[PDB]
RNA sequence: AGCUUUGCGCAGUGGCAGUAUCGUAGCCAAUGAGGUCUAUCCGAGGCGCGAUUAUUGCUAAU
RNA sequence: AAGGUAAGUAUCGUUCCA
């Protein structure tokens, strides 16, 4: 029968998996199979990131950041739906 | 203007090999190597890189 | 004339500590 | 220099940085220190 | 003169006793004094009237 | 002549006798304030 | 003194100046038996490992190598010369002589100070660097 | 049928700290690591070394 | 007598010397 590895190696293995995924993603992006990650922006970061470009057309910029928020939330919700039993 | 690039093949073989089971036993390591025909070790090739070489070799077959 | 500091030993004949400080 | 005061500096830079106030002092009294009456001797002009 | 030829080969290489956190400290950040001192110094220099 | 610090610090003798006198003045100026029912002020004690 | 690498003939010191590009060559010309030279050939010992990244120290006995006495004025008992990419880096001290440190000092921090200053001024591409400390006196009092 | 507990995963939102995170084919360790209160009690990691912009990446200017 | 050389890049002249 199997054995139950302890919480220390639980955290260690989780860290290995996440670092593995991050490095693989970064190597793929350096290759260019996906575009470089666009900076995740919120309402609080709206004028920090895009403010200079957000002065000219503020409503377009807030629409774009809210679209990014909606895309993230939709990715989460449909990820749960795909993982739904 | 041609592709002339197999580097994507290098990334895909790396990502497949990273998900390839390798025994944590040097004995098994060397047993599998003798099964395929690779040497037990190279000059100054310790155990960690022995296992890594085993992984890199069974990435093909 | 020189910038060297002269010892005021022997220069205290007509001065007091509390004078010119009221 | 006040920003440099907190940055990670090797002691070589810090030794030559604490004397910045000694240069503005020399400039502020240059018409007196750089004089012929004091510092008797020959004179040399700057190249430019 | 009466030390064996192997005993000179058996001399131990001495090493440092202190640990990494005392042999090779990470650079010590030198931050300014909290500005509450600048306020307190002038606060102490104000008197009452009665 | 550059003024020397020697002439700008009161002697201890004068300071002690003046301390006695000034504290006597303050005591006389405070016990009266008890009877007159008011707190002291900078105006009274500026001379001291 | 005896621990630092030694150069025996004229070709070796020129090669040691030439065989390096990314550090500073600090050569202690003099006689390792001199009381003056032995005073600072232990300071150069105590910092040889510390400055390994940007400095290499060679020792030269002028009697063993009588080829640079006339050209570099090797007549003070002890001399220190800094070279960068086959270029003598002049250094401005408090003393009148601005090509060498012809006296043996005592503090292991000041010599690393001078070596690092020389390296910093040599990466820029200068020929004369300025020392942090002033040696127009001895700060004794 | 729901309700609900706990651990482990995947993501999401938000807060907080960058004098700290991380490695351990180095060593020792519940057959006891480590002990200042309280010790016929306490009782889990510790040490040494290495990486370091006191975790690490891109994008962005100069 | 000092502690007072900015370090350089150029053509030109000269001279010893190989």
Number of continuous H segments (helices) and E segments (strands) in chain A? 4, 0
CA distance G16 to G19: 5
Among G28, G11, G1, G16, smallest CA distance to G115 is for G28
Q: How was this structure determined?
A: cryo-EM
Whether residue D23 lies within 8 A of chain G, CB to CB, comes out as: no
Burial class (CB in 10 A: 0-12, 13-18, 19+), G60: buried
* F interface residues, E as partner, C-beta within 8 Å: 39-42
Is residue G73 left, alpha or beta, with left meaning phi > 0 and alpha meaning psi from -120 to 50? left
What is the token pair recorded at G141? 């009092």
What letter does residue G52 receive in the DSSP assignment? T
- Residue spans per domain, chain G: 2-136
CATH fold of G2-136 reads: Glutaredoxin (3.40.30)
Strand I positions with any atom < 7 Å from protein CB? 2-8
* Resolution of the experimentally solved model in angstroms: 3.7
Q: How does E11-50 read in b/e, with b if 16+ C-beta sit within 10 Å? A: eeeeeeeeeeeeeeeeeeeeeeeeeeeeeeeeeeeeeeee
What letter does residue D18 receive in the DSSP assignment? T
Report how far apart, in Å, the C-alpha atoms of B61 and of each of B31, B36, D7 are. 16, 9, 55
Q: Which residues contact B53 (CB under 8 A, 6 or more apart)?
A: B38, B42, B45
8 Å CB contact of A24 and B15: yes
What is the token pair recorded at A53? 């470009």
Chain F residues 10-39 with a CB less than 8 Å from chain C:
10-11, 14
Phi and psi torsions of G2, nearest 5° = -65, -20
CA distance G99 to G71: 12
Among G131, G59, G114, G119, smallest CA distance to G84 is for G119
8 Å CB contact of B8 and A33: yes
CA distance B20 to B59: 8
CB-CB contact of G54 with G17 (8 Å): no
């Amino acid at each position: 029968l199997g054995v139950y590895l302890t919480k220390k190696e639980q955290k260690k293995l989780r860290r290995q998996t996440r670092r593995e995924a991050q490095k693989e993603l970064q190597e793929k992006v350096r290759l260019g199979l996906m575009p470089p990650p666009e900076p995740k922006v919120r309402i609080s970061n709206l004028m920090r990131v895009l403010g200079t470009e957000a002065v000219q057309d503020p409503t377009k910029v807030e629409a774009h950041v809210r679209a990014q928020m909606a895309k993230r939330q939709k990715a989460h919700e449909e990820a749960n739906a795909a993982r739904k039993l | 203007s041609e592709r002339q690039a197999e580097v994507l093949a290098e990334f895909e073989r790396r990502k497949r090999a990273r998900q390839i089971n390798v025994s944590t036993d040097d004995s098994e390591v060397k047993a599998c190597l003798r099964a395929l025909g690779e040497p037990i070790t190279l000059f100054g090739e310790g155990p960690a890189e022995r296992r890594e070489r085993l992984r890199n070799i069974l990435s093909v077959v | 004339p020189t910038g060297e500091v002269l010892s005021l030993v022997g220069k205290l004949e007509g001065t007091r500590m509390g004078d010119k400080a009221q | 220099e006040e920003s440099m005061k907190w940055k990670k500096l090797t002691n070589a830079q810090r030794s030559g940085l604490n004397q910045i106030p000694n240069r503005r002092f020399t400039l502020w009294w240059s018409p007196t220190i750089n004089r012929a009456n004091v510092y008797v001797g020959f004179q040399v002009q700057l190249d430019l | 003169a009466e030390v064996t030829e192997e005993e000179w080969l058996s001399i131990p290489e001495v090493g440092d006793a202190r640990n990494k956190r005392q042999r090779n400290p990470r650079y010590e950040k030198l931050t300014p004094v909290p500005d509450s001192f600048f306020a307190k110094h002038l606060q102490t220099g104000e008197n009452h009237t009665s | 002549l550059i003024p020397n610090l020697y002439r700008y610090i009161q002697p201890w003798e004068s300071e002690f006798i003046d301390s006695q006198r000034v504290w006597a003045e303050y005591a006389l100026k405070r016990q009266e304030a008890i009877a007159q029912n008011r707190r002291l002020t900078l105006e009274d004690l500026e001379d001291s | 003194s005896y621990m630092l690498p030694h150069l025996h003939n004229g070709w070796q010191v020129d090669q040691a100046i030439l065989s390096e590009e990314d550090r500073v060559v600090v050569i202690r010309f003099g006689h390792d038996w001199d009381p003056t030279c032995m005073k600072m050939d232990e300071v150069l010992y105590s910092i040889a490992e510390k400055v390994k990244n940007f400095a290499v120290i060679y020792l030269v006995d002028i009697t063993e190598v009588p080829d640079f006495n006339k050209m570099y004025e090797l007549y003070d008992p002890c001399t220190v010369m800094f070279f960068f990419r086959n270029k003598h880096i002049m250094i401005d001290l408090g003393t009148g002589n601005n090509n060498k440190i012809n006296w043996a000092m005592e503090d292991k921090q000041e010599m690393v100070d001078i070596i690092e200053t020389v390296y910093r001024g040599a990466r820029k591409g200068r020929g004369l660097v300025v020392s942090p400390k002033d040696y127009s006196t001895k700060y004794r009092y």
